[PDB]
Amino acid sequence: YQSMSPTVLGFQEEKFTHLHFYFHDVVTGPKPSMVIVAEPNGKAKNSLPFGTVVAMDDPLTVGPESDSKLVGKAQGIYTSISQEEMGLMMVMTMAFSDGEFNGSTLSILARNMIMSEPVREMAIVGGTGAFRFARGYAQAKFYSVDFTKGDAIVEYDIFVFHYK
Amino acid sequence: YQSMEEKFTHLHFYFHDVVTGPKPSMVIVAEPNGKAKNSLPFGTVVAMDDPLTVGPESDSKLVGKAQGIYTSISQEEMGLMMVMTMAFSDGEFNGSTLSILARNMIMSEPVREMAIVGGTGAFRFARGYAQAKFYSVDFTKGDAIVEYDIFVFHYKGELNKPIPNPLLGLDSTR
Amino acid sequence: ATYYQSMSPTVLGFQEEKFTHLHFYFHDVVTGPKPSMVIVAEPSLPFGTVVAMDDPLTVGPESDSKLVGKAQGIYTSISQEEMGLMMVMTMAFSDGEFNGSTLSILARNMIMSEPVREMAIVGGTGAFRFARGYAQAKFYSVDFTKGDAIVEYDIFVFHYK
């Protein structure tokens, strides 16, 4: 079941890629993009109490507007992970559906201090397809939050070193 | 609180998601959209403790365990997010682990690619990918057998001071 | 965060990456007035329990000692044969050179059977951007039935200057 393979599949051409898109967490719609999975400490009217988990199938679009070209999906879960200032842990992938990156994914395991940090860095822990052996990071930042409902648009920039 | 020989291995084995009958290797952790047809509805979470055999038969040589959770992750179709380790119990890689964070997409891709996100023991500094095809699937009842191919880079050995510990005493390699 | 990030455009290898050893104590507080965790789902920690944690990291084994970070995330009971944990967590540091920075961990944690448990660093942030390495956790102080614990951590990461 183990089988040592030779390293000599070696020399590969390196690429750099910058992605820029908009992440849509649609809470209150008639077609919302997430669902609460668990809420110990109950339901707050605008915050997320420590311990609650949300599954998420959030669209990634070229611009702030929902009509703009779909370009990927952010799927996974986020969890309220601070008993002090509200913070989240993102455990998700970003799956690309467009052009040269269709089918490829990037993996994220990151803390997300949405209450206090204006530009938030997230670590790329892995990639697939075009992003095999991906090495990079992301910077996230609120484009808008609607605190009536709780919908949010997050602007992402991705910096990823990888191969062709 | 602060201070300041790479190998490459192919692995082949079989992943046993066992839902039906006695001996279920998993359990459902939450389902906010109840039960569904032949699907886990969006938001369902399932804890696994799945055997890893050298061949597709349950009776086959057990060689590791796939431990973690998966979540049904699409509203448009059935897809999974795997958050898991593969912990091996045999051979050179006994006691070693690989970690996976990956989208599955079990209804749309024959071969599903998954990034190796890190490793332990013999797999320290692991980087690589997995490919997963079904050997056998039953979206009616749920269980399935999944073939895996893993190609992983990694390094061997150890580093090179000890603090007293009332439990474990001294030493640490040191 | 910071207004610029520099790095080497390699994919693999260390190029301009350095090596750091961290040592601290992880506080799993289950009982008493103010616990550091919450049970999230429960389909002593039976298979499938999910716990969310917000655990203080201190430079010594005392709660008293200087706070240097938080370990935050979820753990899950992942084993049917004995109590075993999957950790999905970040370590966020708040002191000294690595104030602001984080490390990500995705790891099995065989708390009943392994006196030293190795956990993969799968990512970092800020001063730990592109982090690679491992943590070693061993108990300093454990009560298996109440659940409280102090875990000694040694962390070895390669990361850039």
Coordinates of C-alpha atoms in Angstrom, one line a residue, chain A residues 104-164:
Chain A
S104 CA -9.6 24.0 -9.2
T105 CA -9.9 24.7 -5.5
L106 CA -8.1 26.5 -2.7
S107 CA -8.3 25.5 0.9
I108 CA -8.6 27.8 3.9
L109 CA -8.4 27.2 7.7
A110 CA -8.3 30.7 9.2
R111 CA -9.3 32.9 12.1
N112 CA -11.5 35.9 11.1
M113 CA -11.7 38.8 13.6
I114 CA -14.6 40.5 11.9
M115 CA -15.2 42.9 14.8
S116 CA -11.8 44.6 15.0
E117 CA -9.5 43.9 12.1
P118 CA -10.2 45.9 8.9
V119 CA -7.9 43.9 6.6
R120 CA -7.9 40.2 7.6
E121 CA -5.2 37.7 6.3
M122 CA -6.2 34.1 5.7
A123 CA -3.8 31.2 5.1
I124 CA -4.0 29.0 2.0
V125 CA -3.5 25.6 3.4
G126 CA -3.8 23.7 0.1
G127 CA -4.9 23.8 -3.5
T128 CA -6.1 21.4 -6.2
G129 CA -6.1 21.3 -10.0
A130 CA -4.5 24.4 -11.3
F131 CA -3.6 25.2 -7.7
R132 CA -1.8 21.9 -6.9
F133 CA 0.9 22.5 -4.2
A134 CA -0.5 26.1 -3.8
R135 CA 1.4 28.4 -1.5
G136 CA -0.2 31.7 -0.6
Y137 CA -2.6 33.8 1.3
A138 CA -5.7 35.9 1.1
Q139 CA -6.7 39.3 2.4
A140 CA -10.4 39.8 3.3
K141 CA -12.2 43.0 3.9
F142 CA -15.9 44.0 4.3
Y143 CA -17.4 45.6 1.2
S144 CA -20.8 45.9 2.9
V145 CA -22.8 44.5 5.8
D146 CA -26.5 44.9 6.2
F147 CA -27.1 44.8 9.9
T148 CA -30.9 44.7 9.5
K149 CA -30.7 41.1 8.0
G150 CA -27.1 40.2 8.5
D151 CA -26.2 39.7 4.8
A152 CA -22.6 40.6 4.0
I153 CA -20.3 41.1 0.9
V154 CA -16.6 40.4 1.6
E155 CA -14.0 41.5 -0.9
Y156 CA -11.1 38.9 -1.3
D157 CA -7.7 39.3 -2.8
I158 CA -5.8 36.0 -3.2
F159 CA -2.0 35.7 -3.8
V160 CA -1.0 32.2 -4.7
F161 CA 2.2 30.7 -6.0
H162 CA 1.7 27.5 -8.0
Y163 CA 2.6 25.7 -11.2
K164 CA 1.4 25.4 -14.7

